[PDB]
Design an enzyme around this catalytic site. Sequence first.
Site, PDB file in Angstrom:
ATOM      1  CE  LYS A   6      -4.325  -1.594   2.070  1.00 13.06           C
ATOM      2  NZ  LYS A   6      -3.932  -2.837   2.783  1.00 13.06           N
ATOM      3  CE1 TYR A  34      -9.834  -3.410  -0.908  1.00 17.12           C
ATOM      4  CE2 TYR A  34      -9.036  -1.309  -1.724  1.00 17.12           C
ATOM      5  CZ  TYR A  34      -8.848  -2.449  -0.973  1.00 17.12           C
ATOM      6  OH  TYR A  34      -7.670  -2.631  -0.287  1.00 17.12           O
ATOM      7  NE  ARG A  86      -5.655 -13.943   4.697  1.00 13.58           N
ATOM      8  CZ  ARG A  86      -6.054 -12.678   4.725  1.00 13.58           C
ATOM      9  NH1 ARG A  86      -6.465 -12.108   5.846  1.00 13.58           N
ATOM     10  NH2 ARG A  86      -6.038 -11.968   3.601  1.00 13.58           N
ATOM     11  CB  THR A 109      -7.629  -7.559   9.996  1.00 15.80           C
ATOM     12  OG1 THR A 109      -8.150  -6.464   9.233  1.00 15.80           O
ATOM     13  CG2 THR A 109      -8.469  -7.744  11.251  1.00 15.80           C
ATOM     14  NE  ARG A 140      -1.746  -6.503   7.808  1.00 11.35           N
ATOM     15  CZ  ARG A 140      -3.065  -6.541   7.936  1.00 11.35           C
ATOM     16  NH1 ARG A 140      -3.688  -5.844   8.869  1.00 11.35           N
ATOM     17  NH2 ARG A 140      -3.776  -7.301   7.108  1.00 11.35           N
ATOM     18  CG  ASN A 170      -3.615  -3.157   6.099  1.00 12.44           C
ATOM     19  OD1 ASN A 170      -3.401  -2.345   5.199  1.00 12.44           O
ATOM     20  ND2 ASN A 170      -4.431  -4.193   5.949  1.00 12.44           N
ATOM     21  CG  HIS A 203      -5.265  -5.942   0.125  1.00 15.21           C
ATOM     22  ND1 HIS A 203      -5.291  -6.846  -0.916  1.00 15.21           N
ATOM     23  CD2 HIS A 203      -6.536  -5.864   0.586  1.00 15.21           C
ATOM     24  CE1 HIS A 203      -6.523  -7.296  -1.074  1.00 15.21           C
ATOM     25  NE2 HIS A 203      -7.298  -6.715  -0.176  1.00 15.21           N
ATOM     26  CD  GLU A 258      -7.745  -7.844  -7.461  1.00 13.34           C
ATOM     27  OE1 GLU A 258      -8.951  -8.047  -7.202  1.00 13.34           O
ATOM     28  OE2 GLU A 258      -7.362  -6.949  -8.238  1.00 13.34           O
TER      29      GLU A 258
END
Lengths: 249, 51, 48, 201, 213, 61, 150, 163
Positions: free
Chosen positions: D9, D49, D85, D91, D105, D115, D118, D129
Amino acid sequence: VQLEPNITLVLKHLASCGAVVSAEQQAALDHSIPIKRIEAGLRSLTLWGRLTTLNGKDYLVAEGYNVASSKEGAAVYETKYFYSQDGARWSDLQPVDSETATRCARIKGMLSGDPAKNYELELVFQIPELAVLRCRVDAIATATSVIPTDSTILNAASQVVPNRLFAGAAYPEKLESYQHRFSLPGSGVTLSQDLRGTWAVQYDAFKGVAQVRSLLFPGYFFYYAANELTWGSLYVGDGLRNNDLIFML
Amino acid sequence: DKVPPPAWSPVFASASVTTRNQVAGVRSNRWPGAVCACAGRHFTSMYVGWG
Amino acid sequence: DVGQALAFLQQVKTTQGASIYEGLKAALAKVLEDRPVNAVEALETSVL
Amino acid sequence: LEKTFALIKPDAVRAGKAQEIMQLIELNGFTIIAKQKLQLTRARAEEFYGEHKGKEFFPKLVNFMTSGPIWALVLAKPGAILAWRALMGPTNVFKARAEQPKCLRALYGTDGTQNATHGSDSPISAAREIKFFFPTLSGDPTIYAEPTAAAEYITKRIQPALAKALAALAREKPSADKFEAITFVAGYLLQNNPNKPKVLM
Amino acid sequence: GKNKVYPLELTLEEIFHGCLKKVAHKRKVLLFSGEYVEEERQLTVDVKPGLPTGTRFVFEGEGNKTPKKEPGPVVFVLKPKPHPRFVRRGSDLVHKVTLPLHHALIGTTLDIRTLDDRDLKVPISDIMRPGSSLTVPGEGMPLPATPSARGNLVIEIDLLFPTHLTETQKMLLRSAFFLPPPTEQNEETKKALRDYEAAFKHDLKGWATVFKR
Amino acid sequence: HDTAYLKETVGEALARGCAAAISAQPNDPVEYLGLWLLKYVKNAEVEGNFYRERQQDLQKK
Amino acid sequence: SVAQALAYLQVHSPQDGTSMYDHLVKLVSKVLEDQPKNAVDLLETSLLVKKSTFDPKESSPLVPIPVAPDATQTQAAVSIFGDPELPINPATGEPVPADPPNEFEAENMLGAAAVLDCLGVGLGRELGVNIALAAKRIGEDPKLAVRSVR
Amino acid sequence: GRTYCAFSIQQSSKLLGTVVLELFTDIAPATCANFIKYIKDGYQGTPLHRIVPNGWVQGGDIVDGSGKGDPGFVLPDETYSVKHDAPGVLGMATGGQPHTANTQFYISLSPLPFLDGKRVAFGRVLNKQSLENLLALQTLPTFQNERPVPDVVIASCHVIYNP
């Protein structure tokens, strides 16, 4: 071996032949060369040479390219040329058309300092100095661009790329170990196929360094260190041509 | 050009005219490669090139 | 099936003198060990 | 061996930690199939999104997602999704700092929405995606290469135009050579097709 | 035989690179109710690099549907959004720059950022005439026919003359504009020129270079 | 009849094009197929051109 | 091991538009389709496959962004070499008000660098030129009125 | 570099002329092959059936010679590439629907914009003399309801310039 000739190595090996640059201009070169390489899209920009002038503001000329392909049996480089009086800020050199290309070869002499100078020929023809400057660089590069043989090879999609497994050229004193940059890797065209007395080679067998000088264009020098496998070329002095070569030899 | 070039041309050591200690000289146009330099009381002449 | 294709590939020879299967295996092993800069171009430029 | 989608991000970008993030990704056994630095526009971000449409955090999320360039990456591993993950962590950054301090994070994230990374969630979303951001990237040779699936795709995507093209070819009856007829049918297909328009100037 | 024509605004960068725009269409279908009912359709338009301004994209079968007649096609007309730097003129860009008079005379390097993320420094090759222009080949919009060749970037020069000049400045300008050729200058003229140049480029008390306050 | 003409005129390459389209899963299968057919008719001559160039180069050597 | 090798082979090359896995699959598929009775040529087949691969070049919804290292530091380093031209006010077309360089007292820094290089210590001549230019920049500042720079 | 075929027209023991045709063997190879096979074994005495003044010269029936269809073969429609725009274009005639073609052939005597896309044309005349022969044949003394009153009969036929 190498992928791009250095600026320090060329300026160091060619110092004996008078191919040197101002100490202040050398410092500015180390900073503004990477800047121009990023401002433009070029991925390989080096210093082509330095042309003298009637003033003290010599034209520092840099050459760079993006793509180098093979068309019509000759390797072509989409070279972009830049000029700068000092090493700080570089300007661009636009190509010239054929009609001006024939009217710029008749302007013999030494270039002036201000790039906004116009020459007159014959009716009167007004030609900018930068057009004359571009002509001389093109003429010199057409006949003097020298690289070691087999240093470039062809891959898929017909692109000439550096030979990463180049092991040097045997007998570096012979002119058969050097070729023009636009000669195809397959073709056996070398500097030997040119006029016999145009090129003179002085090879240091102990230090493993060879020097090639053009007699047709006296201001062009090229070196090739066999031990470290590094080669580079530079041009100093004016871009005029030695027409009466037969009398000199 | 219709103006004959001069036999000597100036040569500088810096692009700025405000450098504190910059050497300056002349370069011969008739004989290429002949230069003269001067800094204060230290002057020198040298000819390097083709004869 | 896959076995038929493998058996066929183990029969056809090549100008270099080895079968296509062994040649491709050697080329892949060379590429894996070398880890070249541009692998796809190096396949046609160096390893073969 | 599977593959998953993950983006760095703009929050993890403006401070120049993207290189460190990639180095950690490589150190943790992953492999970058493809990477690309790119800046989304408002429409592209809204389309991406799509699942959280009409949510309360959607305006701020889409506003933040288009404040700077991101890095889009595909990571390959036998357990790629679950491993990514786990390395992702919780999250929420505040909860992540308490639970596992040594997670991206906690190290780079600064806010619940910021965060700094993604990732994909499920294999179907990951494939969607990957197709969304890398249209030319091949993958999934089992779900697509099924007899019934291929028949269903052919019936409802290419058949409506192919039938008309073949009918036009049969009516015209061009030269018996292969090349002229192939060129004619290809030209008809590229000339009048349902999804694409006709270009005039 | 009516059709709905819609403008489609695209930026110069999108035209240069080749965009893939997704547009929304509101299609109305007439029913027995007094008021109409409408739906939103998504249409994908693929603009090719350097398409000419005014290009029409026609979607057949998309449009308001009367109960009897099949709906007519919908037309999208391509137009470019205003750009701070470049305005396109056919296949090549046009840049209008305000140029100082001393820049035009002495010669300077104009700085232009292309539509592609590349800088460009174009020198002034001669005394720029009033209303003249400069051309940089291979720096414009790509040709719609071939995806390699491009136009030529055109710099339209509008000189910016100084507002005030003092009497000594005018005297110096007259001396510069009526200086004799170097083969005609006197020895006194050469000495005076050298002295004035040294005084003007004096390193501490000359006005050749100054620092803005 | 006309099915024979279609089968021995466009039948062979269309199956390969459909297989390529289903393998790639593009966004515009109708547009993908046409460009595929143009490339299919384009490459047949250039492969022979490459063969000719290689043979000529070897002969010159 | 084998998974790592498969991932490395499936790494996508941006400029070439294909991966090792895809190229190998296409080559083996072409060989299987050919069923060649005679001898084959790996180089010939690889070049022919590379020239025959279909490359659909469709448009991208996002304009490309360039990746490049920051150049603020290098630009600042360059800005000390040549004396900057005085900018002019666009409204009037005349140079903006300016100040003459401040008179300061500094030693011969170039000679100092030469002496240091002769002795074998210091920072070097290339850095000495930059240091001298930066010292000139500091001294010539009228707002930063200094009497001596060392 | 195509195949050529010539045949003579003769009416009531009186030679009317000869005509030579080129066959588009690079456009309709199957139709050309069938036409050559029938001209090698057939067309020897088949009368000219239908003669339209400004239309076409038609004929070539084998088993009956008076305008009925023949058994033993049916010629499928091959290709519509040659356009009926100039006189002296040779083609085959079929039923009201395709894939019923027979030996029945026709030669155009005028531009035929309507006939394109419906009849398979696979040949042309060679010289001006051959076209003038048909133009003179148009103005026969007496012909009853689009058929010559005497028997306009193919006297001879042969093939040249290509095996």
